[PDB]
């Protein structure tokens, strides 16, 4: 946990983070994106519950 | 009006329906899921 | 022949009068939207789809009119 | 349902979140018996 | 930049494509008719 | 080649650039340009979940997205002051409208049988005028066929034609005697006001297309 | 001037802008206003003094702009954050209540109250 | 004739760049900030969990 | 010649009938929007009635239009 | 002959104007139906048959106009 | 040709009539804006965009009249 | 010829009818202003800019009509 | 002859334009009366508004009138 705490402090791209880096750190990214396309739901739930969203309607 | 009437309608329509099929595939397979990557990634950071 | 062509262009002018009705109609739907929202701010998300639906349907009569105008003019 | 009854039920619902003080809860408690009378004669007493 | 995820619901869009083919054929005849007086 | 083909290629190239150099290789933080195409994603997500909401709502979400973006770009490209109007070749927009309309009618008939025409009995009424209310509902049902196309078509056609005719008048207004050339800027300003309005009503009409052919698709997907 | 008093509290008993939800939609009062009496429906209320805004959940009552520019608001109980989850559980109980019986009207008010709370 | 129309387009882009482009800059900035702030907040959140 | 002219003129005049239908449609939708803002919850009952009302109002406009086509083409 | 045939067509066109009032008429009735039903939540069982009656009667004037239009056109 | 040219100039005037409806239309939208803003003192952030949408749509119907007017007048 | 000169004067007259619509419209906007300001006597500073905006836009439809009148008058 | 006839007709047509203005003036005045009765006390604020509204409503009528005269006289 000490080492992990040090890892969060000394390494963290977060001003220029790439989704490619997250796809690399977890294949969960691509798995979920593919599962959503396969599911046929293009609204990922929870996204707008802790990020915004806007609409005209 | 002759600027709204060619007789080239089927010519027009060939290139037109080609653009529609192109964009349909292009959005659906390429450009829409790359926005969905941003969303899913954002939610994955949110969970962790 | 000249009488026919004259009548075509006169007839075109006459049809255009119908559009006035649709313009008032469009306004009436929007008047309702503004009034509804002001009378209840929370209604807005439910009402906004219905408003656009109503706008289009109102507009459609005007487009029928406009099509007669274009049938005379271009045709 | 009288106008003030209408408001009353709403008020009772509003004391439901759970962070609320005892006095709030006490204001929702009540104890009374409306004893009807006539003429002398007394039709039976029954809680509000 | 780009990534590819196939979206397999192009076979849900079968009546749309069928309608496109019918109108395509009909417009061939329309174009030939308009290139005539 | 064909002018129509050349401008369809130009539209394709415009659309590609918004997802291949607008972004910063998919930066999570979000670039100023990439925020635009996020908002577009959200307003069609939240619109087509609202229109064709149901178990399937996202199955026709790519189609409604490329019907948005095609018209959204084609009502900017068609408004460049030296550009060949794909859209004001009305026959392509109207053909596309009729295609979607027929592809709704066929989809509805297939999915909801020959009792698809029960859609055009909308309300209980005495039985001898139940069929009447099918005739003058269906008449209006394929009035939607030509309304959807002619709406957009009229808007685009009217904008270009209005601007060019008034431009031609103001050209000759400033080609006659200089005292009219002075205080001759106000009719130019009228064309400017119309051009400001024409961009607005073109993006509004593109949104109106995609909600209406979602409403027709709502009917086609879900019987009533 | 705003006078907002409740049978167990005295809140605002001038005040710059006040927004009140009434059986007439929503009414806003700023300075002199027409000196109406309007019944307040179960509500989310905002009272603003300067640009600072304070948000009250109001059980409905009566509102009366007085012809002397005194906004008398009286209602049974209220801040908004304090009212705020268990109540969402309660509405399930209330739905059950609609089923059995005066209780229907009561439960209907409960549906209005959860809906209004969920709304904010 | 059409140079009048091009003059109108030039004026149109002038109004857009005058009024809209700073507004859209501010709009884009605002959202960008919100996304970023949420993102960095999430980073904080897990740092708390490590300590817990 | 005169007969050909007459059908074209008549077609123009007939198109004016549509004017009323446009106002009509809008009044139905206006009442819908007003109603739903008034009730918050009428909409389930009212919305079928609104679609019925739309159809009937619109139908009158279609009568105008078919007369226009009977003159113009016919 | 030409004048008489022409006069049929012109007369028919003029006649088509009257139909517009009935269109507006149907809407006025339906507006009241919506408004009333939104006021009560419960008037509707009485008000709905009244509204259908109102529709038919308002329509009837329009239908008389349509008859004259057909009599001019075909007759 | 003099007949047809005269027919154009008359027909142009006929088309001009259509604008009247749009003029009333603009007003109906703005009247709603004023009324609504008076109700809330505060709705205006929501309602003001709705008013802009309303203006554009009503005005657009007006432009259809204007372009037909110019098709006869100039064209 | 006589027909063309006549047509200019006739067409001008027809155009003038359209202007009536804008006049009614202008009044409607002002009516909302008076009633609105009555309902909240301090809404005026917010509402009065909105009112002048609504006036100008309504008036503009009238301007376009009157322009077409002058084009027929002097063309 | 025909050109002079056209002047008299043209003038007549223009007179129709005035009808709208008459309605317009009234609508403003109706609002004045309604407003005054509504506040009892808005009157001093509303009176300059009312004068402005009257003038503008009237102005549209004046434009109709001058076109009517212009076709008649010249």
M46 Cβ contact partners less than 8 Å away, ≥ 6 residues apart: L34, L37, L38, M32, M35, M36, M39
Interface test with G, best of K38, K41, K46 (most G CBs within 10 A): K41
Q: Residue M32 — left, alpha, or beta (φ > 0 → left; ψ -120 to 50 → alpha)?
A: alpha
- F24 contacts on E by Cβ (under 8 Å): none
Give the domains, in start order, of chain J with CATH numbers. 2-75 (1.20.20.10)
Q: Which helix H or strand E contains G17, and what residues bound it? A: strand G17-22
Residue of F211, F68, F58 lying closest to F144 (CA atoms): F211
Resolution stated for this PDB structure, in Å: 3.8
Residue A23: Cβ within 10 Å count: 19
Residue M21: Cβ within 10 Å count: 25
- F161 contacts on K by Cβ (under 8 Å): 67, 70-71
Q: How far apart are CA G10 and CA G24, in angstroms?
A: 25
Q: How far apart are CA L39 and CA K38, in angstroms?
A: 7
> Backbone phi, then psi, for F60, in 5-degree steps?
-115, 15
Q: How far apart are CA C38 and CA K37, in angstroms?
A: 7
DSSP codes of every residue in chain F: --HHHHHHHHHHHHHHHTTTTSSSSSBSS--TTTTHHHHHHHHHHHHHHHHS-SS-SSTTHHHHHHHHHHHHHTTTGGGSTT---STTSHHHHHHHHHHHHHHHHHHHHHHSGGGGGGGG--S---GGGTTHHHHHHHHHHTTHHHHHHHHHHHHHHHHHHHHHHHHHHHHHHTTS-HHHHTT-HHHHHHHHHHHHHHHHHHHHHHHHHHHHHHHHHHHHHS--
Q: Find the distance separating the first CA and the last CA of chain A, reported in whole Å.
A: 47
Q: How far apart are CA G11 and CA F199, in angstroms?
A: 51
Q: How far apart are CA J40 and CA L13, in angstroms?
A: 51
- L47 contacts on G by Cβ (under 8 Å): none
Residue F107: Cβ within 10 Å count: 21
Q: Given the DSSP bridges, would you call strands G70-75 and G2-6 parallel, antiparallel or unpaired?
A: parallel
- F26 contacts on E by Cβ (under 8 Å): 1
Contact K18, L70 (CB under 8 A): no
Contact A20 F25 (CB under 8 A): yes
Chain A residues within 8 angstroms (CB to CB) of chain B = 19, 22-23, 26, 28-30, 32-33, 36-37, 42, 44, 46-47, 50-51
Contact L39 G31 (CB under 8 A): no
- A7 contacts on B by Cβ (under 8 Å): none
In the stretch 38-97 of chain F, residues with CB closer than 8 A to chain B read 38, 41, 62-63, 65-66, 69-70, 86, 88-92, 95-96
Which residues pair with residue G55 across a beta bridge? G46
Contact J23 I50 (CB under 8 A): no
Number of structural domains in chain D: 1
Burial readout G93-118 (b: 16 or more C-beta within 10 A, e: otherwise): ebeebeeeeeeeebbbbbbbbbebbe
Contact A33 E9 (CB under 8 A): no
- C-alpha triplet B27, F201, I29: angle, nearest 5°: 100
Q: Does F191 reach chain E within 8 Å, measured CB to CB? A: no
Q: Which two tokens stand for residue F135?
A: 């005739």
CATH code of the domain containing D14: 1.10.1620.20
Q: How far apart are CA F63 and CA F43, in angstroms?
A: 15
Q: How far apart are CA G19 and CA G2, in angstroms?
A: 11
In the stretch 4-23 of chain B, residues with CB closer than 8 A to chain C read 4-5
Q: Does G115 reach chain D within 8 Å, measured CB to CB? A: no
Contact L50 K30 (CB under 8 A): yes
Contact F214, F207 (CB under 8 A): no
Contact L64 K59 (CB under 8 A): no
Q: Coil, strand, or helix at residue G3?
A: strand
Number of structural domains in chain B: 1
DSSP-derived letter for residue A18 is B
Contact F191 H32 (CB under 8 A): no
Which residues pair with residue B22 across a beta bridge? none
Contact C14, I10 (CB under 8 A): no
DSSP-derived letter for residue G65 is E
Q: Which two tokens stand for residue C25?
A: 């109609």
Q: Residue K7 — left, alpha, or beta (φ > 0 → left; ψ -120 to 50 → alpha)?
A: alpha
Domain that holds residue B34: 1-48
Q: Residues preceding discontinuities in chain C at C–N > 2.5 Å?
A: none
Contact K33, K27 (CB under 8 A): no
Sign (positive/negative) of CA torsion G102, G107, G110, G112? negative
Q: Coil, strand, or helix at residue G72?
A: strand
Could you say which of H31, H39, H51 has the minimum Cβ distance to residue A14? Answer: H39
Contact D17, G86 (CB under 8 A): yes
Q: Which two tokens stand for residue F88?
A: 């004001």
From E4's Cα to the closest Cα of chain B, the distance in A is: 5
Q: Coil, strand, or helix at residue A42?
A: coil
- C-alpha triplet K1, K7, K12: angle, nearest 5°: 135
F156 Cβ contact partners less than 8 Å away, ≥ 6 residues apart: F75, F78, F85, F87, F88, F202
Domain that holds residue D7: 1-48
Sign (positive/negative) of CA torsion F26, F27, F29, F30? negative
Burial readout F153-166 (b: 16 or more C-beta within 10 A, e: otherwise): bbbbbbbbbbbbbb
Report the Cα F216 to chain-centroid distance in Å: 14
Q: Residues preceding discontinuities in chain L at C–N > 2.5 Å?
A: none
Q: How far apart are CA H40 and CA H46, in angstroms?
A: 10
Sign (positive/negative) of CA torsion M60, M66, M72, M74? negative
Residue F91: Cβ within 10 Å count: 23
Q: How far apart are CA K14 and CA K10, in angstroms?
A: 7
B20 Cβ contact partners less than 8 Å away, ≥ 6 residues apart: E20, F66, F70, F96
**Determination method here?**
cryo-EM
Contact E12, A40 (CB under 8 A): no
Q: Which helix H or strand E contains J9, and what residues bound it? A: helix J2-15
C19 Cβ contact partners less than 8 Å away, ≥ 6 residues apart: C62, C65, C66, C69, I19, K18, K21, K61, K64, K65, K68
Q: Coil, strand, or helix at residue G6?
A: strand
- C-alpha triplet F97, F102, F104: angle, nearest 5°: 95
Contact K58, F197 (CB under 8 A): no
Q: How far apart are CA K17 and CA K15, in angstroms?
A: 5
Contact H4, F167 (CB under 8 A): yes
Give the domains, in start order, of chain G with CATH numbers. 1-84 (2.60.15.10), 87-119 (no CATH)
Residue of C nearest to B5 (CA): C74
């Amino acid at each position: 946990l000490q080492s992990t705490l040090d890892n969060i402090q000394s390494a963290r791209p977060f001003d220029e983070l790439t989704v490619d880096d997250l796809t690399k750190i977890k294949p969960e990214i691509d798995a979920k994106v593919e599962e959503m396309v396969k599911k046929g739901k293009w609204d990922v739930p929870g996204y707008k519950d802790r990020f915004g969203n806007l609409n005209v309607m | 009006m002759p600027q709204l009437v060619p007789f080239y309608f089927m010519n027009q329509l060939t290139y037109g329906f080609l653009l529609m099929i192109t964009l349909l595939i292009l959005f659906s397979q390429f450009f829409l899921p790359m926005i969905l990557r941003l969303y899913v990634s954002r939610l994955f950071i949110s969970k962790l | 022949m000249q009488l026919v062509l004259a009548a075509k262009y006169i007839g075109a002018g006459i049809s255009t009068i119908g559009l006035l009705g649709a313009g008032i109609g469009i306004a009436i739907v929007f008047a309702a939207l503004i009034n509804g929202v002001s009378r209840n701010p929370s209604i807005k998300d439910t009402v906004f789809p219905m408003a656009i639906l109503g706008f289009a349907l109102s507009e459609a009569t005007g487009l029928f009119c406009l099509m007669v105008s274009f049938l005379l003019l271009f045709g | 349902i009288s106008y003030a009854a209408y408001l009353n039920v709403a008020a009772q619902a509003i004391r439901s979140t759970e962070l609320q003080t005892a006095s709030v809860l006490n204001r929702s408690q009540t104890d009374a018996f409306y004893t009807q009378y006539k003429n002398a004669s007394e039709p039976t007493p029954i809680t509000k | 930049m780009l990534k590819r995820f196939p979206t397999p619901i192009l076979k849900v869009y079968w009546p749309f494509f069928v309608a496109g083919a019918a109108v395509y054929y009909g417009m061939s005849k329309a174009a030939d008719l308009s290139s005539n007086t | 080649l064909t002018t129509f083909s050349l401008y369809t290629i130009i539209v394709l190239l415009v659309i590609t650039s918004l997802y291949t150099l607008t972004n910063n290789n998919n930066k999570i933080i979000g670039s100023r340009w990439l925020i635009s195409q996020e908002a577009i994603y959200d307003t069609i997500m939240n619109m087509t979940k609202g229109q064709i909401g149901g178990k399937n709502w996202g199955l026709y979400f790519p189609m409604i997205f490329t019907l948005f973006m095609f018209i959204f770009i084609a009502n900017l490209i068609s408004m460049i002051p030296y550009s060949f109007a794909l859209s004001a070749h009305l026959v392509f927009i109207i053909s596309l409208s009729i295609v979607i309309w027929l592809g709704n009618t066929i989809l509805g008939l297939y999915k909801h049988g020959w009792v698809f025409f029960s859609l055009f009995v909308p309300a209980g009424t005495p039985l001898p005028l139940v069929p009447l209310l099918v005739i003058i509902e269906t008449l209006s049902y394929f009035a939607r066929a030509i309304s959807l196309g002619l709406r957009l078509g009229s808007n685009i056609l009217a904008g270009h034609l209005l601007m060019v005719i008034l431009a031609g008048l103001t050209f000759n207004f400033m080609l006659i005697n200089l005292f009219t050339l002075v205080f001759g800027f106000v009719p130019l300003a009228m064309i400017l006001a119309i051009m400001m309005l024409e961009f607005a009503i073109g993006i509004i009409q593109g949104y109106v297309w995609a909600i209406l052919t979602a409403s027709y698709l709502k009917d086609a997907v879900y019987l009533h | 001037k705003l006078q907002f008093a409740l049978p167990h509290e005295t809140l605002y008993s001038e005040v710059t802008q006040v927004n009140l939800p009434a059986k007439s939609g929503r009414i806003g009062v700023l300075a002199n206003h027409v000196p109406t009496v309007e019944q307040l429906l179960p509500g989310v209320v905002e009272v603003m003094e300067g640009s600072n805004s304070k948000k009250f959940f109001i059980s409905g009552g009566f509102a009366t702009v007085q012809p002397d520019s005194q906004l008398c608001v009286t209602a049974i109980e209220a801040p908004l954050e304090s009212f705020s989850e268990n109540i969402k559980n309660l509405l399930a109980e209330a739905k059950k209540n609609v089923s059995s019986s005066r209780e229907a009207a009561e439960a209907a008010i409960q549906v209005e109250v959860l809906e209004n709370l969920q709304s904010v | 004739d059409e140079s009048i129309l091009l003059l109108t387009f030039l004026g149109f882009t002038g109004l857009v760049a005058k009024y809209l482009a700073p507004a859209y800059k501010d709009f884009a900035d605002a959202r960008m900030k919100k996304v970023s702030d949420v993102l960095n907040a999430s980073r904080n959140k897990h740092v708390e969990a490590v300590k817990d």
